[PDB]
Paper text:
[name] ubiquitously occurs in animals, plants and bacteria, and plays a significant role in iron storage and detoxification. It is a nearly spherical 24-subunits-protein with exterior diameter about 12 nm and a hollow cavity of 8 nm. Like human H-chain [name], the ferroxidase centers of HuFtMt are composed of A and B iron binding sites of conserved amino acid ligands His65, Glu27, Glu107, Glu61 and Glu62. Herein, we take the compartmentalization concept to re-design the intrasubunit interface of [name] to create a new compartment for fabrication of fluorescent Au NCs, while keeping the inherent protein cavity functional.
To this end, we obtained the crystals through co-crystallization of three mutants ΔC, 2Cys-ΔC and 3Cys-ΔC with Au3+, respectively. Subsequently, we determined the ability of these three mutant proteins and wt HuFtMt as biotemplates to synthesize Au NCs, respectively, following our reported method by mixing protein and HAuCl4 at basic conditions and a further incubation at 37 °C overnight.
Residue numbers in the entry:
A (entry chain A), B (entry chain B), C (entry chain A), D (entry chain B), E (entry chain A), F (entry chain B): 6 to 176
The structure:
Amino acid sequence: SRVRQNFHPDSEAAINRQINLELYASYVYLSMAYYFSRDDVALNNFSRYFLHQSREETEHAEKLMRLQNQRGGRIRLQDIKKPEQDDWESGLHAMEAALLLEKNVNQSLLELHALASDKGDPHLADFLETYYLNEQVKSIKELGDHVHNLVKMGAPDAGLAEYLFDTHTLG
Amino acid sequence: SRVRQNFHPDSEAAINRQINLELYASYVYLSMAYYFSRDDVALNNFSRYFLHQSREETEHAEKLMRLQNQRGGRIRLQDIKKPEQDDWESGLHAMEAALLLEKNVNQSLLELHALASDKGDPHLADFLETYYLNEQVKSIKELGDHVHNLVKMGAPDAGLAEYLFDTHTLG
Amino acid sequence: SRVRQNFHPDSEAAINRQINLELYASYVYLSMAYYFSRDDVALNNFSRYFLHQSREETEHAEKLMRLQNQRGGRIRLQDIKKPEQDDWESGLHAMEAALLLEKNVNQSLLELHALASDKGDPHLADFLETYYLNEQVKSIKELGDHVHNLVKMGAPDAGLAEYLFDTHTLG
Amino acid sequence: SRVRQNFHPDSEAAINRQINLELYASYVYLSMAYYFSRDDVALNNFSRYFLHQSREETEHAEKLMRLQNQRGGRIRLQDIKKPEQDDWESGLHAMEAALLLEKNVNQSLLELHALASDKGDPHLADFLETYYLNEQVKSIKELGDHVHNLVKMGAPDAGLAEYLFDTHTLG
Amino acid sequence: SRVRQNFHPDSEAAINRQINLELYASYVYLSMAYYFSRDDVALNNFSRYFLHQSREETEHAEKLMRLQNQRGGRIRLQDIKKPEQDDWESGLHAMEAALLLEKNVNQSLLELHALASDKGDPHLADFLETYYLNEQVKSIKELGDHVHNLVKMGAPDAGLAEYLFDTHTLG
Amino acid sequence: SRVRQNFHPDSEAAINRQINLELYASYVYLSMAYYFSRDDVALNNFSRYFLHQSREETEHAEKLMRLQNQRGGRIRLQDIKKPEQDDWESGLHAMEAALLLEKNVNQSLLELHALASDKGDPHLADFLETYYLNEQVKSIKELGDHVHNLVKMGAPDAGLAEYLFDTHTLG
Ligand SMILES: [Mg+2]
Ligand SMILES: [Mg+2]
Ligand SMILES: [Mg+2]
Ligand SMILES: [Mg+2]
Ligand SMILES: [Mg+2]
Ligand SMILES: [Mg+2]
Ligand SMILES: [Mg+2]
Ligand SMILES: [Mg+2]
Ligand SMILES: [Mg+2]
Ligand SMILES: [Mg+2]
Ligand SMILES: [Mg+2]
Ligand SMILES: [Mg+2]
Ligand SMILES: [Mg+2]
Ligand SMILES: [Mg+2]
Ligand SMILES: [Mg+2]
Ligand SMILES: [Mg+2]
């Protein structure tokens, strides 16, 4: 590529793997979003919350795809694995699953950053720091907040907990 | 499901298959969109066009997921298969692939409609007719228009064709 | 902490020490601010300048406290040491003391950054670079400018110097 | 000091002690504020409430520093002691600690007022009455209200109490 | 310098060399801009495009000069070498020359970043990442896009190519 | 050149030399501008003043480059020589150097005008008179004003002079 400069094939590959992971995260959140609009779940603000997260993950994927193009890498898409469950069990369980997902995505981003650093790719390093690392920290913190509140409120067994959390925190 | 009424498990299954197909179509268009943003393709309005199509396909998927929940079905997500190519070769080839994709999706929707009709599910039948069947016809027609113009203009070999089509038709 | 990820206890501790240092800097500037509104100093724009700096330092402290929470660290507050003087002697001396303070805070931030780097904490590294390192450089530069002008103008002995600097530069 | 008039050195000293106490109160509230932003507390309106209180205490400190300068006293800053805890245990416990803090600050202000009265300093007496004594009464009353509601609602053990109090009263 | 802190003389020198390189890039683009407004070239949007790039390069130079001052370095200006050609041959050739120039400038910036990293200057590292590295990637990508389109369109020999590219892409 | 008319190659050459001189003047002013932003100079309105002059010189250069193209001449760029100093010593010395620079540029413009007149090029003559000769007179007068005031005020040794001149005249 006539634009490619200081862009290691390993970084290119890792970016492609990260693209897939971001798409996967979008899919997970999409699944959660539509779990919460089931008639036997019907937590519309959980649904909206995860829908929003899903679209944010798509933007995360797209920024990496743009990065790949900008750097002269070649996007290599892979299957977006279905989420691990279709029944996310409860608002709390979904929040906990999302928290685990974000920490896993964060770990992947940190490994990607270590790779960028190993390859002396400050542009990639900065790209991750600018657009992903703090977004991950904020997302993990937010999910942590949500998990704690839901746990403290007695979710999922306390019938009012997820309902009230849905209307107040996620409203 | 206490909302489920006149909703055949075959229709539920076919809706889940259609959800996956719509997600797949979104993915195909996403791949195309970022193919045209490659430095060695750089047809930004092809890119935008397919990006828009990608997001519309996501809405197609979501409406079916909404339908599933509305009818008391249970969304069953599957892997979103990667698109058949990462290199979409040219604006014309991408348009032709999109055309083939839309006709395939249309065939799936028509089969879904035949199933809805077979199962006496007028709500599902109307749902497809209202939101999918004409949208598919419109999309197939548009892609056909685009394919014809690109062919007529000499794409992909005529160097000005895809460039001018990008700026004029997709602008 | 269920949010804690790639966050070394040393970094957590260093952030707590930095929080204290930022609070200390706020206090120093608060002291300076109210030194300059003494009836026998009465340099109201020196006062406002240092008051503004004081509040900025509080925001610096708060961002680190937020960082601590975001990363799952536990804020550990310590006494905010009183400033080294209550009588800041002159506009020039206060500016020079502030300059020294900022360079000391900068050194602490650079050590914190080296620690983040040593611990492979790019989020923390980026956090410091994004919110502190350049703010420090700009603050040190500004104080350097102020010190130079005050020195060149003949502060503190030239009776018009701090007065005119107060009204023009700090106005 | 050419402005000093009817300003007893005891009052000057007591004002300096009160400045420190107000700064200390600010610090206590700052600690509480960021306690409630912990991922395992995550009561954002408790956090905001105490943050607001913290900044109000800083204004309390500053008005006394202003008073010191206005009267020709000399501000003598002391270490701002760290708050007694970094872990404020619960919204209720923090409210109760804040209540105790405000009554302690109020006692100090009342002693300061008695001193002002003993020294025939009506300006200082009026200053305290105008800006501190009723503010303290209001603050103590508000915290008492909050404590009662939290207790009545079952805080901290009733999982919904602090959550609902956070969203409704502190919202 | 009383502001100088953690600023290695090598970094200072490298910044001065980078200032010159940025000024040089501005000059190259200025030359290109006025090449395209020759009566026998007369591609006014190529001209405007390179004029814009020229002024952007001046801002790149100025930010480095400001950085030098901010850090306490001493700007040391050198001759701005004339561009390698006055006759830039064609829109395509100018775009290709600009692409090569940007990659060369990028290489210099990456070397500067490696130096900053070697010298443990995170402020300088962040400065380059924040203001230069991604700007370079975007500029190289854009020029790559432009080069590809011009090549594909048949520039410079296809008489309509640069004309149409001028009006559509650079308009 | 099919536009070239009554345009002597000597005039073309002299215009190219004048372009370089205007670029050089821009560079001198750029150097001065960033000299006054040094932490040990810190005369921000001197800095702004010379920065403005620098950009005006670039416009002077560009109008001549425009003229060259308009007349069918061929721009021949040369190295832009670095300014004679990086340390401009004082606001007064910089003003005096700028004054000398402008008179030198003016002399070059007057020689260019004499050449235009010798070659019977009234368009070039008018071009210089319309856009350069009075601008030079105005600039030389302004710098003379500034030099006189700075001298009269006691610059550079009177510590308040350049400071006050910076804030009042250059503000
Ligand atoms: Mg993501
Ligand atoms: Mg496969
Ligand atoms: Mg599987
Ligand atoms: Mg569709
Ligand atoms: Mg029908
Ligand atoms: Mg600070
Ligand atoms: Mg202690
Ligand atoms: Mg002590
Ligand atoms: Mg780094
Ligand atoms: Mg108070
Ligand atoms: Mg009374
Ligand atoms: Mg540049
Ligand atoms: Mg030389
Ligand atoms: Mg040469
Ligand atoms: Mg000029
Ligand atoms: Mg005449």
